[PDB]
Structure formats: C-alpha cells, structure tokens
C-alpha cells in the first residue's frame, strides 16, 4: 500500500465520519432518488472512492478532492436547498476541503 493510498484512506475515514447516516456511503439508486441516473451524469460516492483507492486509481490528493467535490456537487444539483442531503453536502464539502488543507 503506497503513501498516497494511506493518506487517502485516512482522509476518507475522516470524511465518512461526517456522514453518520451513510447517505454518501454507496451509489445513489434511482429507487431512492427517482430519475437520478438521468440527471446526474457522473455519479460519485464514498464507497466508489474507497474502491478507487484500493485499486490505486488516485495518483494525487487533487484527484481525490475532485471526486469528493463531484459527490457533493451532485447532491447539490439533484436536491433542493431545503433538504438534509443538500445541506449535508454543502457542509461536508467545506469542512472536508479544510480538513484536507
Ligand atoms: C446522496 N443522496 C443520498 C440519498 C439516500 C441514500 C440512501 C438512503 C437514503 C434514505 F434512506 F435516507 F432515504 C437516501 C438520497 S435520497 C434523495 C431524494 N430522493 N431526494 C429528493 C429530495 C426532495 S427533492 O424535492 O429535492 C427531490 C430529490 C437524494 C439523495 C442523495 O442525494
């Protein structure tokens, strides 16, 4: 396991602690979010991020950050602002980026 894999696994653990319901733990299904796949072109979730770390697909912290932001932007695109999902996404986006400096 490489230094980047170790750091990104660390960051991912810390970020998932901010989502205790696991709303971001797995790909959003169309069953839970009607029409999701037709609206969101590039889905992302923490579980996919973990698989990408294990597969050694991230070669920089920038790339990991970009996936994290994608995940949050998707939730802010799909959901109305008055929803737990939009608010959580916005919160964890800023906290996450700070956390990761
Ligand atoms: C990231 N994310 C996650 C969920 C989600 C995933 C698993 C389980 C659950 C739960 F058990 F809590 F229901 C929710 C959902 S569900 C959803 C959904 N149905 N959202 C609607 C909220 C009301 S609205 O008028 O904004 C239309 C979208 C969006 C997302 C999401 O982005």
| Cα–Cα dist 36/53, whole Å | 25
Domain count, the chain: 1
Please check whether residue 23 is in contact with residue 84, taking contact to mean a CB–CB distance below 8 angstroms.
yes
| Cα–Cα dist 78/63, whole Å | 23
Task: Quote the tokens at residue 49.
Answer: 């991020």
Query: What is the residue with the minimal CA distance to atom 13 of ligand 1?
Result: 32
Cα distances (angstroms) measured from residue 44 to each of 1, 3, 15, 53, 99: 23, 23, 14, 13, 20
| Cα–Cα dist 30/39, whole Å | 10
- The approach used to solve this structure was X-ray
| Cα–Cα dist 21/25, whole Å | 8
Say what the resolution is, in angstroms. Answer: 1.7
Task: Quote the tokens at residue 8.
Answer: 């990104």
Q: Give the residue among 37, 18, 25 at the shortest CA–CA distance from 92.
A: 18
Give distance in angstroms: CA of 39 to centre of ligand 1.
13
Instruction: Ligand 1 pocket test: pick from 32, 40, 45, 46 the residue with the most ligand atoms within 8 Å of its Cβ.
Output: 32
Task: Quote the tokens at residue 74.
Answer: 């998707």
Q: Give the residue among 14, 16, 28, 12 at the shortest CA–CA distance from 64.
A: 12
> What domain range is 36 assigned to?
1-101
């Amino acid at each position: 396991s490489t230094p980047i894999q170790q750091l990104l696994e660390h960051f991912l653990r810390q970020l998932q602690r901010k989502d205790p319901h696991g709303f971001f733990a797995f790909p959003v299904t169309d069953a839970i979010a009607p029409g999701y796949s037709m609206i969101i072109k590039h889905p992302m979730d923490f579980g996919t991020m973990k698989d990408k770390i294990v597969a050694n697909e991230y070669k920089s912290v920038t790339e990991f950050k970009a996936d994290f932001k994608l995940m949050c932007d998707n939730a802010m695109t799909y959901n109305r602002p008055d929803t737990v999902y939009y608010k959580l996404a916005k919160k964890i986006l800023h906290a996450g980026f700070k956390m990761m400096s």
